[PDB]
Write a protein that binds this ligand. Structure first.
Ligand code: IHP
Ligand code: HG
Ligand code: HG
Ligand code: HG
Ligand code: HG
Length: 410
């Protein structure tokens, strides 16, 4: 029987938090629709129990997957430290780490380590906001505008079809924002009523107006769907095409603010350092978060911006068949180090593991038989590859060292 020529030696999963209630409920959100937003079973921004179950499924899947690759034992709790879990201080990320452990090894109580000070943000997930490093305002401004085609106006102008789809879903024409508008000489328009401007500072970047609103609203519609609510978008979202059109507004914002290299590299450096050190073979030692690296499996509960920052920084591009959100709740950026038995050389494979929107809607349990979606990624900047398209450890290490911003390391 043909035997595998590669042996899995280490896995690093950067995961976005699972399904959660929208993070805010502003007046603007109510003014763009005459309808009422459906309420959620948990506080704003918190993980819903269904979201935890969905993450638990991925945890269950990963356990089966890793067992077949012989990295984890089929029975019992993983050895001490064999599995390490790190999470951002947010309630949803902490709970996502807990839901993953529960699914990976039920009743095994794998600790979910976070920064000790839980009332302060963790720079690992955003060194910009905590002041670890700064963005070059002038350079970032030019890079974002450049990728926008010169202006936000031209950017949004190319996505009016998607904006009109959102307006339709919101029944925008019959909203307070529309009715109480004075310049009623022209038709009501989200992009016109809320001009979008690029804001750039040393610690942050943002798009005001319709761009950021549309990006948040469409994500909420996705959240309603994944949460299993009766009629997302008030029943006005009836087919896959509409889902894609709507979410494209969401992916569009991330393309500008989170994938742009001038922002991504800085914002992803701490995570790049962690990932590299965890994937690089070396003597174990209690490190950051009280975790010992390297180890078999490291699961990091982060956010969608983290996945996008890492994609931009590593030049990893992807689209997820069945999932309109490129960085969906529970989505996992998976890094694996495989050793080639023939010569003991080290290789790194990157992929994006995720649940399709329907698998979230139907809350379908996962397993090797019913696996979640998975896309094998290709590091666009890697030259030295093996038969299976993986990048050599040296190649990967070169890519990370050139991408990271030293000034942003922790
Ligand atoms: O960590 P927070 O301070 O609570 O900020 C959150 C978080 O963004 P980050 O990646 O910067 O952490 C959400 O991302 P997830 O944790 O869900 O992965 C994002 O939600 P979306 O981008 O998916 O919509 C949301 O933004 P939003 O206003 O659209 O809810 C945003 O909140 P802020 O805009 O206030 O920073
Ligand atoms: Hg800890
Ligand atoms: Hg280490
Ligand atoms: Hg996202
Ligand atoms: Hg998202």
């Amino acid at each position: 029987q043909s035997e595998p020529e590669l042996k899995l030696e280490s896995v690093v999963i950067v995961s976005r938090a699972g399904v959660r209630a929208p993070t805010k409920a502003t007046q603007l959100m109510q003014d763009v629709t005459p309808d009422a937003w459906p309420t959620w079973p948990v506080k704003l921004g918190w993980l819903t129990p269904r979201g935890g179950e969905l993450i638990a499924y991925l945890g269950h899947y990963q356990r089966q997957r890793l067992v077949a690759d012989g990295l984890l034992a089929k029975k019992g709790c993983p050895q001490s430290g064999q599995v390490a879990i790190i999470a951002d201080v947010d309630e949803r990320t902490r709970k996502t780490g807990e839901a993953f452990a529960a699914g990976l090894a039920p009743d095994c109580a794998i600790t979910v380590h976070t920064q000790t000070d839980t009332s302060s943000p963790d720079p690992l997930f955003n060194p910009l906001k905590t002041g670890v490093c700064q963005l070059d305002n002038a350079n970032v401004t030019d890079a974002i505008l450049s990728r926008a085609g010169g202006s936000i106006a031209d950017f949004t102008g190319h996505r009016q079809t998607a904006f009109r789809e959102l307006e339709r879903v919101l029944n925008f024409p019959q909203s307070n924002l529309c009715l109480k508008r004075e310049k009623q000489d022209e038709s009501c328009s989200l992009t016109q009523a809320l001009p979008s401007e690029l804001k750039v500072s040393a610690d942050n970047v943002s798009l005001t107006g319709a761009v950021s609103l549309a990006s948040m609203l469409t994500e909420i519609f996705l959240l309603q769907q994944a949460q299993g609510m009766p009629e997302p978008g008030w029943g006005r979202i009836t087919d896959s095409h509409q889902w894609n059109t709507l979410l494209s507004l969401h992916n569009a914002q991330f393309y500008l603010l989170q994938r742009t290299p001038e922002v991504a590299r800085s914002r992803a450096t701490p995570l790049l350092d962690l990932i590299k050190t965890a994937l690089t073979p070396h003597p174990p030692q209690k490190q950051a978060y009280g975790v010992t690296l390297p180890t078999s499996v490291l699961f990091i509960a982060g956010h969608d911006t983290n996945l996008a920052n890492l994609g931009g920084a590593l030049e990893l591009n992807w689209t997820l068949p069945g999932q309109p959100d490129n960085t969906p709740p529970g989505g996992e950026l998976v890094f694996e180090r495989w050793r080639r038995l023939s010569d003991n050389s080290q290789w790194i494979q990157v992929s994006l593991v995720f649940q399709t929107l329907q698998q979230m809607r139907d809350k379908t349990p996962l397993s090797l038989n019913t696996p979640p979606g998975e896309v094998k990624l290709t590091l666009a900047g890697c030259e030295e590859r093996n038969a299976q398209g993986m990048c050599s450890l040296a190649g990967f290490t070169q890519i990370v060292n050139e991408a990271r911003i030293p000034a942003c390391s922790l």
